[PDB]
C-alpha cells in the first residue's frame, strides 16, 4: 500500500521473502457503460423525426 | 462390513435341558435375540440323507455369523442359531465361539457349526 | 406429526439396526428429525406447521414485483398495510412460488402446511437413505469408494463423509424440483 | 449451558464411544464447547436469549443503506439516534437480513433466538460430527484432504486439513447459511 | 499405532498371594499402572456362561495389548490387566509375555489371555 | 500464566501420555509455552484481560481514516489527543472493526475480552492439536497420508508433513483470524 | 554456555534418543553447536536479553521514512540525535513495527520484550527439530523432497535435500522473521 | 463493495489473506441490441420505396 | 541396512571358564569388540521377576543383532553380547548363530537369545 504517490516508499520495488502473494490486475474497462453505438442511433432517430 | 451384506435372518436361541421322567433327557431351545446377520462358509459339508452333517471332529467351526454386537448379552457355550429361509429347508447351527471384531464392539463374529438342515427340525419356542 | 409419517419400526427395519442399544430412540428421533428438516429444505415442501410472519415489503421494480421470504399457503389473501395506504389491500398469490404483483409498507401472510398426509414415497426413500447413512457414518475416517481407505500420496479425495449427497437423497428428491 | 441442548450421552452414542470411552468426560466438555462455538460463529446464529447491541453506523449506498453487525431479531423495531435526528427513528427489519434503508449516528437493537427449542436439528447433527472428528484426531496423523486440482507450485502436500470441513460439518450445517 | 487407537482404559496390576489361615490361599491384585492402551484379538473365545473363558492350553495368548513403554517397570510373570468399560462387564487379562516393539522402547505389546468377563469380579485395590 | 488456563493434566489427558516418563514436566512446559505464542503471534490476540493501549495515529486518505491495531472494544469510546487537538475527542468504534473516522496524533483504548475466563475453546483446541503433534512427531522422517512412508521414485511429497502445522491446529486458530478486505 | 540454554537431556528427550543412545554425547553437542549457527543466522536475531542499541540511520524514501533494525517496545519513545538537529527528538513508535517518520544522524532505543528473555521458546523447536533430523540422517540415505512441480529438466531426482526445511525448521523459525 | 467512488476505502487495493476468492469480470457488451446492420438496411428499404 | 538404524551400543564378549578350587565353576566374560549394532525382536519374552527370561527351549533365538562384518573375528559358540542403555537395566544376550548377510561380507547378523535383564548383572572385564 505505501507505494501510492506521496508515500514512504513510493515507486520502489516490493520484496517478499517467501510465501508468494499472487496479484492479478483487474481490467475495469468501463469504457462502454452508456453503449455509444445503440445510443447515438436513438439520438439520430429522435432527431430525424423532428426534421433536423 | 457392508450393512447390505447382512442378508440372513436368524434367531439366536439358548438351550434349556432337563431329563424326562421316563429316564431320557430333553432339550428345549428358547429364542432370545432376533436380527439380521451375515453367514459365510469356511469348510465343506457332508450331508448324509436326512440332512444331518457328518463332520467327525465336532469342534471345527464351519460357518461364520456376524451380527450387531450387544453388550448386555453373553453368548455362552450353550447358544444355538436357527436360520430360516424362503424355499430352502431351515438350519440349526451350534455356536462354538465368539469374537468381538477388532474389539471395536460393533460386530460379533460367531464361529459356529452346522448341525442339521432338513425340513423337520423343531423350531424354537 | 412425524411419528405417523415415519414409524421408527420402518427405520429400524430398513437400516437393519434393531438389536444394538447404541442407537436408542432419542438419538434415532434426532436423526429422523434432521432428515425431515433437510427434506423440506432442499425440495421446499413445507413440513413445518404454521409460522405466521409479518415482514416489511420493499417494492422493487416498475413492473411492480413483490418478493417474499417464505412462500404463502396458496389461497389465503396476503394483506398489505401502511406505507401510505389507508385501507389495506388483499392479493392472492400463485401456488408454489413467492412472487406477487402489485411509515413503510408491510405484509403479513401465512406459511407452512396444516394437513398430515400427502408425503410421496419418493421423499421417504430419500429420508430412509439419509438416516441409514448417519447411523453408521460419523465424522471420522474420511473413507473412499466401496467404503475403502486410501493413502493417496498427494492428498485425499474429499467430500466423501458428507451425508445426503454420497447417499441417495439429494438425487432421490430432484424429481420434485424444477427450473 | 449446553447439556440442555445436547447431553454427553448422545455424543457418546453417536461417535460410537459408549462402550470404549476413548476420552474422559471433561475433555468431552471442552470439545463440546469448541463445537458449539464453531458452528455458532460459522453460520452467524447466536444461542443466548439476546445481546442488545449499540453500534455506530455510517451511511453509504446513495439510495441510503444501513448494514448491521448482528441480524436484528425479527419483529422488533430497530431505533436510530444521534446523527442529527430530532427524535429516535424507528425501522422494522427484514427477517434474517442486516440491511435497512433510511454528532454521530448510532443504532440499538437485540439479537435473537431467545428460545431453546429452535436449533432445528441440523446444527446439532453437524456438531455431533465435528466432535466425532476431534475424538479421534488428536493431531498426530496427517490426514490432509485435497481441494482444487493444480498441485501448489511450492510442491507441498496440499491444503484443507481442517476439522469440520473434511468431516461432514460444513455440508451438514450449510443448508442454513444464505448465499449472497 | 496412531495415538487415537489407544481407546481402552486399563489397570496393570501385580498380584501378591498369602495363605488363608483356614487352609486356602488368596491373591491380592493391586494396581501399579493406569493408562490408555489398544487391544486386539488373535483368537476366538469359548465363554461358558458366567464368563470364564474355556481355553484349554492356558498358555496361548488371545489378546494383544499395546501401551506406552516405561523403562523402570519390569512386567513380571505375575502381572494382570484389569480393563473396565462403560456398558460392558469388566475383564481380567493375565499377561503371558511382553514385546518391546521393534526395540524402539516406545510401546509395549503384552500378549495376554482373557480369564473372565462378568459383572462380579474383584476390582484391584 | 498458562498454569491456570491450560493445566498440564489436560494436555497429558489429551495426547494420552500420562504414563510416559520420557515427557518430563519441564519438556511439556516448554511445548505448552512455545505453542501459546507460536499460535498467538499468528492470531495477534493478547491473552491477558482488558489491556489498555496507547499508540500514534496517522490519517490516511483524503476523506480521513484511522487504522488502529487492536480491534479495541465493544461500546467504549476510544479517545484521541495531542496533534493539534484542543481537547481530547472521543469516538465510538464499531464492534469487531478497527477503523475510525473524524505533536503527533495519539489514541488510547482498551482491547481484550472482559473476564479473566480467557481464550475460548477454539484457541485451546489448536494448542492441544499442536502440542500432540509436537510430542509424538519430531522432525526426523518425512511422512505421508495416514502416516505411511512412501518412495515416489522422485521427490518426496513431504513439503510440509515433516513437522509443520499439518494437524487441524493451525486451521482451527484461523477460524478466529480475520481476512482483510 | 549453550547447554544452559538447551540442556542435553531436553535434546535427548525430544529426539527419542533415550534408552537408545544413538550418536554419543560429544556428537550431540557438536550438532547443538552447529544448530545455533543455522538458527540465528537464518533469523538475523542475536543472543542477548533486552538490549538497547545505537545505530546510524539513513533517510532513503525522500518523504522521510526511517527503517530500524529492531523492534522498539510499545510506549518507550526512541530518540534521534546527531546530524542536523538542535536537540534529541522524541518519537513514539508504532506498536510492533520499525517504521518511523519526521554529522551522522543516529538513533537509540530499547529492543526485545521488557521481561525476562530466554530465547523465545518457539525459535527452539526448530533447533530441537534440526538436531533430531541430524541424528537419523547422517548422510548416506537419499531423501529428497520436491520444490518445483515440473521436473528437474533431466533425469535428476528433483531436489530440496537440505535439512532444516525438510525437518520443519525453516517454517518454525519463520514466525520471528521479517518479510519486508 | 466499499471501493465505489466516494467509499470508505475507495480506490485502494484488495488484500485477502488466505482463502483465495476468485473474481471474473463479465463483459455485458450490450452494444448491438438493435442489430444496427440488419436495421439500417430495412430503413434504406422502406425509405427507398417512398422514393427518398 | 540404514546406517542410522544401527542405534544400539553393544560389547561383544567371549566367555572364559574355569572351576573354583572350592569345587564349583566360574565364568568370566571379557569384552572383545565394541561397536554400534541394530537389534530387533523375533519372539516374545517371559520376564519372571528378577528379570531372567523364562524361555523353555533355550535354543530358539529371540533377537537379531546386526553389526559391521569383521573378517578376522570368529564369533564362536561361546560369545555373548552385553548391551547397556541409558535409563533401562542392562541386558545379556547369548549368541546362538551368525549369518553373513547375503555373503556380501558387509554385515554380520547374530542370532542371539536374551538371557537376563536386571540392574545387577556382572559387567564385562
Author numbering:
A (entry chain AL), H (entry chain AK): 264 to 315
B (entry chain AP), E (entry chain AM), I (entry chain I): 1 to 125
C (entry chain T3): 2 to 103, 124 to 200
D (entry chain S3), G (entry chain U3): 2 to 103, 124 to 201
F (entry chain R3): 2 to 103, 124 to 202
Sentences reproduced from the published study:
Caudovirales, the taxonomic order for the tailed double-stranded DNA bacteriophages, is characterized by the presence of a tail—a host cell attachment organelle that is connected to the genome-containing spherical or elongated capsid via a neck. We describe cryo-EM structures of the neck, the neck-capsid and neck-tail junctions, and capsid of the Agrobacterium phage Milano. The tail to capsid junction involves a symmetry mismatch that is bridged by the neck, and is therefore crucial for the assembly of tailed phage. The extensive network of disulfide bonds within and between neck, collar, capsid and tail provides an exceptional structural stability to Milano.
The 15-fold, 12-fold and 3-fold symmetrized maps of the neck were used to build atomic models of the collar, portal, and neck devoid of capsid (portal + neck 1 + neck 2 + tail terminator + collar), respectively. Namely, the dodecameric portal ring (12 × gp7), which is embedded into the capsid shell, connects sequentially to the dodecameric neck 1 ring (12 × gp14), hexameric neck 2 ring (6 × gp15) and hexameric tail terminator ring (6 × gp18). Besides these conserved common elements, the Milano neck complex possesses a unique, external, sheath-like structure surrounding the neck and consisting of four pentadecameric rings of gp13 (15 × gp13) that we name the collar. In the dodecameric neck 1 assembly, the α-helical and β-sandwich domains of gp14 form the core and peripheral ring, respectively. The core ring connects the neck 2 ring to the portal. The lumen protrusion loops form a diaphragm-like structure that constricts the channel spanning all proteins of the neck and the portal protein. These loops decrease the diameter of the neck lumen from ~30 Å to ~18 Å. There are two alternating conformations of the lumen protrusion loop, with six tilted up and six tilted down. The lumen of portal, neck 1, and neck 2 possesses a positive electrostatic potential resulting in a positive charge of the neck lumen —suitable to hold and position the end of the negatively charged linear dsDNA until the genome release.
